Amino acid sequence: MNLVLMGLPGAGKGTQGERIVEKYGIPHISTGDMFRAAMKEETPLGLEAKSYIDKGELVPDEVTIGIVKERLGKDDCERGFLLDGFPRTVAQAEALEEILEEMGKPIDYVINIQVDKDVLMERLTGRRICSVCGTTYHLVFNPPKTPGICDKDGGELYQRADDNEETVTKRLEVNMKQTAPLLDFYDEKGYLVNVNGQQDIQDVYADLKVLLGGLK
Ligand SMILES: Nc1ncnc2c1ncn2[C@@H]1O[C@H](COP(=O)(O)OP(=O)(O)OP(=O)(O)OP(=O)(O)OP(=O)(O)OC[C@H]2O[C@@H](n3cnc4c(N)ncnc43)[C@H](O)[C@@H]2O)[C@@H](O)[C@H]1O
Ligand SMILES: [Mg+2]
Ligand SMILES: [Zn+2]
């Protein structure tokens, strides 16, 4: 089960990806999570990625492709993988094609989680994350029991540094710009599927199960 998740910022890739790997026995590989972990830990990768991420720009292709290639070579990817937020550009997709060709692990579905750009600011500015366990909430759409406090371990919730109006606007522009070309790229390959991401989380996941069961 070799999958790519794509979607505009806030469309629900992490939310769906976490659900997918809980059920299906494959690793969740998020380039955003990888970069942010590097930033949190102040590693050289973090220091390089930070100047781009803080502005809402894409990290350059060379390093991004490099870290994914190394990640996909690990034993935990032998039975499949869920790439979340990679590829994000046609160049990245072309590089990944070659990578997966030699592994004998070509993509089964590129899942485009479709969400109207007009609702994505609200998804992102309302996002809250636990400082302790990383569990994700939304102020309105998926709130904790006590505002500002995680249900699981009582950790304080915070707002991602890039989830402010200015940076979200940049992220949407940057990612929109790469979107139509990438959708066209995969559609021509034949395994792009669009899923309606503008439903309750449970209902988006239900639609996803109907497709993914064929790869179980
Ligand atoms: N390949 C690459 N190349 C170059 N640079 C790269 C790169 N990959 C990463 N980068 C760099 O790293 C940065 C960060 O990347 P990344 O962390 O991937 O940011 P992103 O793609 O903007 O996506 P998010 O993580 O913000 O949103 P999501 O789709 O995961 O939504 P979530 O499920 O959390 O949901 C969001 C909110 O909505 C809520 N929600 C989810 N689903 C629903 C629903 N169905 N209804 C209502 N609310 C919902 C959630 O509770 C939550 O509050 C990039 O900006 C770039 O700088
Ligand atoms: Mg995410
Ligand atoms: Zn927590």
Q: Please name the residue that has the structure tokens 């998926």.
A: 142
Nearest ligand by distance to the CA of 200: 1
Domain encompassing residue 92: 1-216
Residue owning the nearest CA to atom 53 of ligand 1:
127
b/e sequence 46-81, b meaning 16+ C-beta within 10 Å: bebbbebbeebebbebeebbebbeebbeeeebeebb
DSSP string, 98-141: HHHHHHT---SEEEEEE--GGGHHHHHHTEEEETTT--EEETTT
Q: Quick one: which of 71, 60, 77 has its CA closest to 33? A: 71
Q: Quick one: which of 30, 185, 186, 39 has its CA closest to 107? A: 186
The tokens of 55 are what?
């502005």
Which pairs count as long-range contacts for 31-38, CB under 8 Å and 24+ apart, including other chains? Answer: 31/59, 31/64, 31/67, 31/68, 31/83, 31/84, 31/85, 31/86, 31/88, 32/84, 32/85, 33/84, 34/67, 34/71, 35/59
Q: Resolution (in Å) of the shown entry?
A: 1.6
CATH number at residue 96: 3.40.50.300
| Residue 86 CA, closest ligand 1 atom number | 1
Instruction: Please tell me whether residue 146 adopts helix, strand or coil conformation.
Output: coil
Residue owning the nearest CA to atom 52 of ligand 1:
127
Domains held by the chain: number: 1
Amino acid at 213: G
Among 13, 19, 123, 128, the one annotated catalytic? 13
Solved using? X-ray
Q: What are phi and psi of 134, to 5 degrees?
A: 80, 5
Probe residue for ligand 1, chosen from 15, 117, 150, 198 as the CB with the greatest number of ligand atoms within 8 Å: 15
Angle at 25 between CA 212 and CA 65, to 5 degrees: 85
Q: Quick one: which of 129, 173, 165 has its CA closest to 8? A: 173
Residue 123 CA to ligand 1 centre (angstroms): 10
